[PDB]
Paper text:
To achieve this, all the main light-driven components of the photosynthetic apparatus, including their allophycocyanin antenna, are replaced with red-shifted paralogues. Phycobilisomes are a structurally and functionally diverse family of light-harvesting complexes, which bind open-chain tetrapyrroles, known as bilins, that absorb visible light and funnel excitation energy to the photosystems. On the other hand, the far-red paralogues of the phycobilisomes, the major light-harvesting antenna proteins in cyanobacteria, retain the same type of pigment, phycocyanobilin, but shift their absorption by modifying their protein environment.
Here, we solved the structure of the intact bicylindrical allophycocyanin complex from the cyanobacterium Chroococcidiopsis thermalis PCC 7203 at a resolution of 2.51 Å determined by Cryo-electron microscopy single particle analysis. The map presents density to fit two antiparallel far-red light adapted allophycocyanin cores at an angle of ~30° to each other (see Methods section). Each of the cylindrical allophycocyanin cores contains four (αβ)3 trimers, arranged in two face-to-face [(αβ)3]2 hexamers. The 1st and 2nd (αβ)3 trimers, which are proximal to the thylakoid membrane plane, contain the far-red light specific subunits ApcB2, ApcD5, ApcD3, ApcE2, ApcD2, and ApcF2 as well as the white light shared subunit ApcC. As suggested previously, the second hexamer (formed by the 3rd and 4th (αβ)3 trimers) is held in position by the second REP domain (REPeat domain) of ApcE2 and contains 6 ApcD5 and 6 ApcB2 subunits, but contrary to expectations, the distal ApcC subunit is not present. Due to its location, between 3rd and 4th (αβ)3 trimers, the absence of the distal ApcC could be due to its loss during isolation, but the absence of any ESP density that could indicate partial occupancy, together with far-red light specific changes to the binding pocket, suggests that this subunit is natively absent from FR-APC cylinders.
Numbering used by the authors:
A (entry chain J): 1 to 169
B (entry chain H), I (entry chain D), J (entry chain B), L (entry chain F): 1 to 161
C (entry chain K): 261 to 347
D (entry chain I): 2 to 159
E (entry chain K): 695 to 705, 710 to 724
F (entry chain S): 1 to 67
G (entry chain C): 2 to 175
H (entry chain E), K (entry chain A): 2 to 158
Write the structure that this text describes.
């Protein structure tokens, strides 16, 4: 996996344009938000359990059939698996927020995720909904902490959804 | 793997019969050729690094493969290609000693095309490299031994394609 | 994770409890010969995917087995010698 | 990079990034602009660096394939010198030897042994380039740049 | 396209006088 | 081939986190010479203690006949 | 510590520390005086923080072993909280959370299950302690110390509060 | 020795020497006179081989640590040449490359990189030594000696 | 293993008390010395192979230990000695960076003396070579940093004695 | 691993004779005790966690070993001690069901003294906790079953020191 | 025995014995009286079993080492028959073939091949001994005993 | 392990000198006995099972070793003893072929006494069996080859003492 700086530096040699003006501008823009990325990751790590618990409770509110008999969140075994996987998603999204690059998600979260979920019958719609709920809760916590320009926080979660959701149109 | 003797034995065994005179003649031909096969193996073993260096020089250097964005870009990929060529040369020597291409199919060619496609390794470029290696070996060990080794080099090239 | 290229993971205890149980064999030099032979058969079933030792005439196995039964080597060294064997 | 190393260390233990690792990452993100300025200085002066260093290297190491009358060898050597100067600049941008190591340190000995180019000559050339670069950098910037030259030299020594 | 021998064409007057010699040799 | 008779105690440093089954950590075994450096490094890096090392098989200072 | 972690990572890969790791070590060394000042501040405010947090905790959760009328249990609970504050100070000095993990986090749930202390009570106590630490320290000192208390809480926060499958009423006790 | 190799091959299968091993053993034993004669030739002409090979190798590789004007370095290189001739004699006597491997081949690259001796220069010196040594014996003996000289050269590469 | 901070923290933690002012002064001293420690680590890392080359040249070469009958005779034993010296230097750099000799006890001297005794490795020559390595490092990094590194080199030598 | 029946069988086998009336009396005694042994095994299997918790509360808590500077200090070592006690209880139940102490010798006491000495685990405290576990089991299951489990716990304690 | 088998089954899964294992253990310890009395009738009738079985075995297999006019060979064969009867009594007592396997089955083929005693002859003698011993007990008692006899014959083939 | 040629080579290489005329004469002597060595090895291979049968019948049968309570009692221990005798014969053949006892010291006698004492194997009975096997081999292969094999049989017996 790579972070933003590593990918940009390697692309500098790959593309043959070296350290031109556009690369310098993108590097400066990225470095301007680095402290905010670290702060966002700190907030996510300090409130991980609360975020996951809130998101899973809201998911079971919006999908009451999940916890009913025959549902996928039926029994504490599957409930614990739900919580565990949502923690996985939150952890790797925090990693991607720090790195500024989505390669960590590609290599350690999304590679083979669809195969696993098809094998185990894990529904993807509720998975995307839970990721979006976690994203909303993280945004609420960041607004509470006083952060202002936190658009990049949307990038991992949304991206993950786009990678796991099926094609409808 | 099976060599020429084992290939003839297996051909006779599926019919449940001893080696017929034609198979015995093929066996005697292999036994007679074993001396030049050992000589070729000695020469290739002694000049393997030079062979691979000349192969890369006449096949891959100063093309786009070694440029950034090529598949031999960075020293790690260059060394990986050199290692693959070393494997090809060594197992061509094995097959030349054994008198048949079974070892090449078992240890190299089974799924090598799929692996190369997955990794983005250009098949045409490595086929060109194998043919250049065949020319280099022919230049080193002579015409007859070069042709004998080129049989297995051509087998490798066909298996890649 | 065993290295920096491998991720670390967590498994709730409920998933482990509900899952099928691996019968784990521990070799002890003080165990009886039958139990040691059962552990050795387990080693063969794992390394060779099946106890192929009798089928292929793995006679040298005997020596290895002695070196395991007498306690000279461990299961780790037994497996290492099996991996380097001709079988 | 150090960001990637910290993320991998946290991932191995199945834990979020600890406050100390976050502090380290924040410090390097703060230093990123200074590293970018240093790398820009390296890039803008790479041609003079390569020119002076190559002249010094052919003075001190004359029995080398680039200094043998072959135009192609000399051109390839100069291209490699420029390549390594640019790689050191990019790895200065990143702030750790990881990009330079991944592009031109892992397998460099094997690549140049296959090319039949002596690695001691490469060490001499990198030494000359390092001296020329240090001539045009402040001590504080040299503290950032020199260890990558040293990493390359160590990776090139047989 | 199994033949690539046409693309393996490999890759003069010296550009330096007195090559591979040190300065001020005794 | 040269063999070392090695006694060691190598406790597990992560048995609480992984909840692996308890295993005996004090062993004596024959390690081939070619694997002893790596085995010793592994034991050292696991926090274990190498108690006794003997050259069980082979002779010190041999120049040939190691195979 | 961070130096120990860097050395272990380098030794696992059989290599010297990279220039970036050395620079991170140099930054950590430069931050040492501030780290020591923070550790001293935390040490000097230990007793008062513990006392106020105990008061708040007993106001919040009365049905606890530390509020069962046993003086030994009360002393043990206050001692445990002081120990966790001490471990946080160790983390401040060491530059990472390793002292906390190796002394009071690995096996903490097993220890409290064996001793008999409910972990939700421990979590509420630690939330009260975090509130007291935030109240006493300056905003910068709190911003530097609170993350370690949050790290402690994250270990013992699941499963548990919050609960959302309800009407929000808390007076159902009868 | 090849005898050790075949005995260990038989032992790896926990089995008495098979007819292939016995045939190899008899073939090796019946060439004892030739191997001893080759070893005597190498021992008697060691200094001549070293001198002629050093001359040719310094002609081919003038820029080498041996002839950099250092007397001790020249002496050390010539002693190394003599030692490798002796190891090739050992390998000829034993019928296998095992003495050469265990004395002069395993770790040769590490040792010479520590000494800062270019490996290509040692390869060229070994080639010159092989050319000098093969000219002091018949073709049949040359076939055996060149194998171990090539083994040294390949280990250096 | 342990470093200076970890050692002080553990010594305070076994008593169940915060770091006393003596320990805080020691921690401040370590933090102050950290700049020199990092500079020395960088310098040693930049010259590791040359350091080992010089150590072997000035301690073991042209003695009876490299002559036939010596323990550094044959190329494999020479390579093993060089490998050991490389590990000694790397772990001494680790210990100097950590400001603690515990890593030397855990990962250098843990069974090393018994291995050397069983193998016939001359302990006196090994101690001499470690002292030569200390001298080479001192000549590279100066007298003060050289003394600091020599503390851990001498710890290694004392453990091997 | 061995049980009472196999122990008697081996005792008669080394003599080359059938089981004498004394051995048959011992076998009958074991057969009669089997029902009580099964009841004890069921009770201990049902109350293993409670037994270990009560043992820790009775013997190890509020002592020097659980205070800072003791071996049960820090949560990791506390959990390790609890896990050790759980294993002791389970293998004591195994031995009680078998009627022999051989499983304790080969599974628990093999290398346990050496591991404890190397790690610095206090053997006296371990023996004290084993005796406390015996008392707790006796208070749970009864007097005769408590006596049998106690003899196996006493064998464990004697093996420790 | 059955007890150690159940305990090892539970130990391999790192768990206390399951209720079904406990029930099997209780059912086994209940039948101790029957096992003891079967072992007793096996010990008291061992001589007549040996005599009748050897007579029948010599009737159907005359060309055997025991029936070759050697007194010591006959005595040792009858001793072996008695020893295997004793081992089967041990197996009856233990409830499983473990005593027989440990004492006289593991390595039986190697031992008897070293003694140059044909294995088919010993299988025939074991069959004769089984048919003699089964006639001296109730059919319900025989269920165990015959099985153990089969264990001797299968291991010897 | 070492054979005669490798032993001479090692002894000469420790001095750093070519093989002196005495060593060359010893090498020629070893070379001229290779045919007898091969014939003896083939004969012993062909009669190994009978040799072990005769050895057991001559030195171990109808003693207290095979009686109950003896170490050769039960089928597993009898098979283990026969296996050990087979190992002794095979490795003595290996040593006879190699002309050196190094194979015995490295693969037979390495800690054999310690294992025998730990398991209670009677060393005196084993030495008597080795002598019986030497006598059987002498009676099978002749006087000269019998004495040649008896050299290594006596080496095994001395190693067991
Ligand atoms: C060289 C002629 C061309 C070339 C090669 C190249 N290959 C890789 C990577 C791999 N090559 C293999 C090959 C084999 N697998 C086998 O089982 C065998 C039989 C012995 C062979 C030859 C494999 C497994 C890999 C993947 C593992 C690895 O990366 O080492 C690379 C590197 C690719 C990368 O992305 O790093 C390269 C460069 N590439 C060219 O362009 C040449 C034409
Ligand atoms: C100059 C200081 C030294 C020198 C160099 C030299 N190089 C070549 C040829 C090549 N160099 C490369 C280098 C790289 N490949 C990569 O991926 C990278 C990125 C890290 C580098 C730097 C390559 C691929 C080649 C092959 C040709 C090509 O570019 O396609 C030569 C010519 C060799 C030949 O045989 O033609 C030379 C001379 N020579 C010296 O003497 C200096 C020590
Ligand atoms: C000559 C062909 C090349 C050459 C050699 C050279 N060697 C040295 C010094 C040493 N050489 C050895 C060699 C060996 N040690 C062994 O154990 C074996 C295996 C039998 C060998 C071959 C050693 C140990 C040394 C160190 C000195 C010593 O003998 O104690 C030098 C001098 C190095 C120096 O810096 O003094 C040289 C020059 N150099 C060439 O250029 C030739 C290609
Ligand atoms: C060099 C200074 C001296 C020397 C060294 C020498 N060592 C060996 C063999 C081994 N050395 C080790 C050492 C280590 N193991 C560890 O874990 C560590 C800590 C990092 C060390 C230093 C080991 C394990 C071995 C044996 C295994 C192996 O080599 O892989 C030899 C070879 C001995 C032989 O008989 O072959 C030598 C020569 N000898 C000297 O004379 C120098 C003074
Ligand atoms: C608790 C009563 C006392 C205590 C225990 C304690 N033990 C360790 C470490 C280990 N304990 C074991 C135990 C076993 N090994 C076996 O083979 C068996 C039989 C199946 C058992 C029970 C082992 C292997 C270890 C090593 C670590 C590991 O998990 O592998 C510790 C930890 C020591 C440390 O962290 O340094 C402790 C605390 N200590 C006391 O003070 C109690 C009186
Ligand atoms: C009788 C059914 C068959 C038979 C037997 C026979 N046996 C011997 C000699 C021996 N038998 C044994 C047997 C055992 N040893 C053990 O440890 C066990 C397991 C408990 C058994 C069964 C042994 C050790 C001997 C050797 C002598 C001794 O006891 O000391 C002979 C004599 C052979 C000879 O003298 O060469 C015979 C004949 N022979 C038959 O024909 C029957 C099929
Ligand atoms: C027969 C002459 C005497 C005898 C032998 C006996 N040995 C064992 C057990 C072992 N024997 C060995 C020996 C070796 N194993 C090897 O791999 C090699 C080298 C190829 C040798 C020499 C070993 C290691 C053991 C222990 C492991 C095992 O059980 O096989 C036994 C079994 C003893 C037991 O049951 O514990 C016996 C009976 N005993 C005599 O009484 C004869 C005089
Ligand atoms: C083995 C069978 C089994 C059970 C029973 C089980 C229980 C269970 N109860 C739950 C919730 C809940 N359960 C309760 C209440 C209570 N529950 C009780 O057993 C009490 C009698 C009662 C309180 C008096 C409440 C209030 C919730 C919602 C918690 C929330 O707000 O998230 C949940 C979480 C899923 C959800 O919120 O729908 C599970 C899994 N899991 C299982 O696998
Ligand atoms: C540094 C690692 C470490 C920890 C944490 C630790 C804790 C610890 N706390 C204990 C007691 C105790 N701990 C508490 C604590 C609590 N009661 C409440 O109401 C609170 C929510 C909670 C605060 C954490 C209580 C009440 C006891 C007394 C229990 C008893 O008397 O049985 C005990 C048992 C008795 C003793 O040893 O004194 C231990 C081992 N030991 C260690 O080595």
């Amino acid at each position: 996996m790579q972070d933003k700086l590593t990918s940009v530096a390697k692309n500098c040699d790959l593309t043959g344009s070296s350290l031109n003006r556009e690369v310098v501008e993108t590097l400066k823009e990225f470095l301007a938000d680095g402290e905010k990325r670290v702060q966002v990751a700190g907030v996510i790590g300090s409130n991980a359990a609360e975020i996951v618990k809130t998101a899973v409770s809201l998911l079971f509110q919006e999908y009451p059939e999940l916890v009913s008999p025959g549902g996928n969140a039926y029994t504490t075994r599957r409930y614990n698996m739900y919580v565990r996987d949502m923690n996985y998603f939150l952890r790797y999204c925090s990693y991607a927020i720090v790195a500024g690059d989505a390669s960590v998600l590609d290599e350690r979260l999304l590679a083979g995720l669809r195969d696993t979920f098809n094998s185990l019958g894990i529904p993807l719609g509720p998975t995307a909904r839970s990721i979006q709920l976690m994203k909303n809760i993280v945004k609420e916590k960041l607004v509470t902490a006083g952060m202002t320009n936190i658009t990049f926080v949307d990038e991992p979660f949304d991206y993950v959804v786009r990678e796991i959701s099926e094609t409808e149109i | 793997m099976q060599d020429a003797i084992t290939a003839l034995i297996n051909s006779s065994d599926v019919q449940g019969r001893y080696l017929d005179p034609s198979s015995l003649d093929k066996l005697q031909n292999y036994f007679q050729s074993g001396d030049m096969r050992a000589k070729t193996a000695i020469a290739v073993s002694a000049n393997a690094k030079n062979i691979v260096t000349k192969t890369v020089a006449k096949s891959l250097l100063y093309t786009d493969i070694t440029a950034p964005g090529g598949n031999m870009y960075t020293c790690r990929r260059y060394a990986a290609c050199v290692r693959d060529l070393d494997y090809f040369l060594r197992y061509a020597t094995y097959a030349m000693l054994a008198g048949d291409t079974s070892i090449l199919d078992e240890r190299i060619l089974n799924g090598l095309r799929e692996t190369y496609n997955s990794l983005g390794v250009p098949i045409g470029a490595t086929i060109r490299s194998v043919q250049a290696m065949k020319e280099v070996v022919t230049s080193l060990v002579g015409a007859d031994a070069g042709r004998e080794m080129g049989v297995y080099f051509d087998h490798i090239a066909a298996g890649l394609s | 994770g065993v290295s920096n290229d491998q991720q670390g993971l967590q498994l709730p205890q409920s998933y482990s409890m509900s899952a099928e149980v691996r019968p784990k064999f521990v070799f002890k030099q003080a165990a009886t010969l039958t139990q040691k032979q059962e552990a050795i058969a387990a080693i063969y079933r794992h390394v060779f995917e099946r106890d192929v030792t009798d089928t292929y005439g793995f006679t040298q196995k005997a020596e290895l087995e002695s070196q395991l039964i007498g306690g000279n080597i461990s299961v780790k060294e037994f497996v290492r010698r099996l991996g380097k064997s001709r079988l | 990079s150090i960001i990637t190393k910290a993320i991998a260390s946290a991932d191995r233990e199945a834990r979020y990034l600890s406050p100390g690792e976050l502090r380290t990452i924040r410090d390097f993100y703060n230093g990123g602009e200074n590293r970018l300025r240093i790398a820009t200085t390296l890039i803008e002066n790479r041609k003079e660096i390569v020119e002076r260093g190559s002249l010094k290297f052919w003075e001190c190491c004359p029995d080398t394939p680039s200094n043998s009358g072959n135009r192609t060898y000399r051109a390839s050597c100069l291209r490699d010198q420029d390549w390594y100067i640019r790689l050191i600049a990019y790895t200065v941008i990143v702030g750790d030897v990881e990009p330079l190591k991944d592009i031109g340190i892992v397998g460099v000995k094997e690549m140049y042994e296959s090319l039949e180019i002596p690695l001691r000559n490469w060490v001499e050339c990198i030494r000359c380039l390092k001296e020329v670069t240090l001539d045009l950098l402040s001590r504080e910037d040299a503290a950032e740049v020199t260890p990558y030259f040293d990493c390359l030299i160590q990776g090139m020594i047989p | 396209s199994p033949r690539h021998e046409n693309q393996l064409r490999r890759e003069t007057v010296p550009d330096k006088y007195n090559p591979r010699k040190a300065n001020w040799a005794a | 081939m040269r063999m070392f008779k090695v006694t060691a105690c190598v406790p597990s440093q992560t048995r609480i986190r992984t909840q692996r089954e308890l295993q005996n950590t004090y062993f004596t075994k024959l390690v081939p010479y070619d694997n002893w450096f790596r085995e010793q490094q592994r034991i050292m890096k696991m926090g274990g203690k190498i108690v006794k090392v003997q050259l069980a098989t082979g002779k010190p200072g041999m120049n040939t006949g190691l195979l | 510590s961070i130096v120990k972690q860097m050395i272990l990572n380098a030794d696992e890969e059989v290599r010297y520390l990279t220039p970036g790791e050395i620079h991170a070590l140099q930054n950590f060394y430069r931050s040492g005086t501030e780290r020591i000042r923070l550790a001293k501040v935390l040490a000097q405010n230990e007793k008062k923080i513990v006392e106020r947090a105990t008061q708040k905790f007993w106001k919040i959760c009365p049905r606890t072993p530390s509020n069962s009328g046993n003086a030994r249990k009360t002393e043990a609970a206050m001692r445990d909280i002081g120990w966790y504050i001490r471990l946080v100070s160790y983390c401040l000095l060491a530059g990472n959370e390793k002292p906390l993990e190796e002394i009071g986090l690995i096996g903490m749930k097993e220890l409290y299950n064996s001793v008999g202390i409910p972990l939700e009570n421990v979590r509420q106590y630690m939330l009260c302690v975090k509130a007291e630490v935030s109240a006493m320290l300056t905003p910068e000192d709190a911003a530097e110390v609170i993350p370690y208390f949050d790290l402690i809480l994250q270990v013992i926060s699941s499963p548990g509060a919050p609960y959302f499958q309800n009407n929000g009423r808390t007076d159902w006790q009868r | 020795s090849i005898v050790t190799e075949l005995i260990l091959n038989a032992d790896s299968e926990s089995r008495y020497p098979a007819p292939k091993e016995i045939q190899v053993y008899q073939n090796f034993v019946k060439t004892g006179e030739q191997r001893i004669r080759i070893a005597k030739i190498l021992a008697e002409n060691e200094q001549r081989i070293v001198q002629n090979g050093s001359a040719r190798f310094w002609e081919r590789v003038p820029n080498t640590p041996s002839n950099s004007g250092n007397e001790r370095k020249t002496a050390s290189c010539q002693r190394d040449q003599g030692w490798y001739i002796r190891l090739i004699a050992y390998s000829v006597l034993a019928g296998s490359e095992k003495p050469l491997e265990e004395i002069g081949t395993i770790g040769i690259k590490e040792m010479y990189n520590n000494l800062e001796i270019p490996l290509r220069n040692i390869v060229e010196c070994m080639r010159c030594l092989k050319e000098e040594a093969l000219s002091l014996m018949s073709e049949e003996d040359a076939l055996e000696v060149s194998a171990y000289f090539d083994y040294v050269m390949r280990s250096l590469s």
